[PDB]
Design a protein around this ligand. Structure first.
Ligand SMILES: [Mn+2]
Ligand SMILES: [Mn+2]
Length: 391
């Protein structure tokens, strides 16, 4: 049916609280809706043309009589609302065990065991930017040989040490220890990150010697199946990292949302057969977690303005899928993601009559099931394809 599928995850761009939002303390959450209200009307005319307002009408986002493609929202079935859970579900899995975040730092039980296994004390133990934590604790780390352990708003455990105090190979081994300790549901972290730095007090800089220790998806994904069947799987942005490279044939790293759209355009220009899969992370990383609705709105408007060029490049046998992985409502309390429905837009220029409303997707895995059916690869255990509906 389709030679190429272009899948775009607008990271954290949720479309209103899910039925189980209360389980997470996420009642009232509405990412796009609250941004629209803050912007006094979001300017997203191209998403509107695709049918975004037909899913839900929000300030500045109204329904259209003839949407370019098909539209609906998706409900998350997996236990957690983190990025890995969302993406793993999108590609055909079901994840019972959520990844955890640590707004007050890591539990004493974990750090005590890390201290025992490394013969070093742990300092910091809080959310912080790389720069902030080095300014505060970099000197102490140097003087003592303690390990700086910190986190972000996401499911990460970061370990900073001066390269002349803890040599790279030693820091990597420490991170591997930390990775094994954090394969535990009491404190399951998405990735352990080595954060080596150099310099002197008041002038510390992190080195390009960072290493990541991620968990692989809890199952063979639709990406695995595509790769194993000799299809192209082109990962753009954080996609390769999120899946620990599983099922990825080529990875295109990006530096911003606009760079991600440039790479999407690059893949439109490529002759491939299979999947081009983009994550636009700025929404989540720069605006959602920082609870910055203005910046979030601006980012959404910048993204929307790039879309007509994508529309112009799509072929008759190309499918464009636009969705999200969870919410991250920039006016919600705290710094965590929000449990929300995610929008789904499915567009191909071969839809000569435009689109219609699809039935609500009961799991994100419906995307994976649709991709798998299209390319004739092994169907995921979870998910219901909407491929036949796109006609
Ligand atoms: Mn995410
Ligand atoms: Mn996040």
């Amino acid at each position: 049916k389709y030679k190429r599928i272009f899948l775009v995850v607008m990271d954290s761009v949720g479309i209103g609280e899910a039925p189980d939002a209360e389980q997470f303390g996420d009642l009232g959450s509405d990412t796009i809706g609250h941004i629209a209200e803050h912007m006094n009307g979001l300017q997203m005319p191209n998403m509107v043309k695709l049918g975004l307002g037909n899913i839900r009408e929000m300030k500045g986002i109204s329904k259209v009589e003839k949407p370019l493609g098909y539209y609906t929202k998706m409900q998350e079935k997996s236990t957690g609302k983190d990025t890995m859970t969302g993406h793993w579900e999108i590609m055909g899995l079901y994840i019972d065990t959520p990844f955890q975040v640590f707004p007050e730092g890591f539990p004493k039980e974990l750090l005590d065991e890390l201290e025992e296994k490394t013969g070093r004390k742990i300092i910091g133990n809080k959310p912080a930017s790389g720069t902030e934590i080095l300014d505060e604790l970099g000197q102490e780390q140097m003087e003592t040989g303690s390990l700086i352990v910190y986190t972000s708003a996401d499911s990460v455990l970061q370990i900073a040490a001066h390269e002349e105090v803890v040599p790279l190979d030693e820091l990597y081994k420490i991170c591997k220890i930390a990775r094994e300790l954090t394969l535990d549901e009491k404190y399951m972290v998405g990735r352990v990150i080595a954060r080596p730095f150099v310099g002197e007090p008041g002038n510390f800089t992190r080195t390009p010697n960072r290493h990541d220790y991620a968990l692989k998806p809890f199952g063979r994904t639709v990406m695995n199946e595509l790769k194993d069947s000799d299809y192209d799987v082109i990962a753009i942005g954080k996609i390769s990292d999120i899946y620990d490279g599983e099922g990825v044939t080529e990875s295109l790293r990006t530096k911003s949302n606009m760079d991600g759209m440039d790479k999407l355009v690059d893949t439109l220009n490529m002759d491939f057969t299979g999947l081009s899969f983009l994550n636009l992370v700025d929404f989540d990383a720069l605006f959602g977690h920082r609870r910055d609705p203005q910046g979030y709105g601006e980012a959404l408007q910048e993204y929307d303005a790039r879309l007509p060029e994508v529309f112009a490049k799509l072929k008759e046998d190309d499918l464009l899928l636009i969705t999200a992985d969870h919410g991250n409502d920039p006016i919600h309390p705290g710094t965590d993601h929000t449990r929300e429905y995610v929008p789904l837009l499915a567009y191909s220029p071969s839809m000569k009559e435009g689109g219609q409303e699809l039935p609500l997707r009961q799991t994100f895995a419906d995307i994976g099931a649709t991709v798998a059916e299209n390319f004739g690869v092994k169907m995921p255990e979870y998910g219901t394809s909407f491929l036949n509906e796109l006609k």
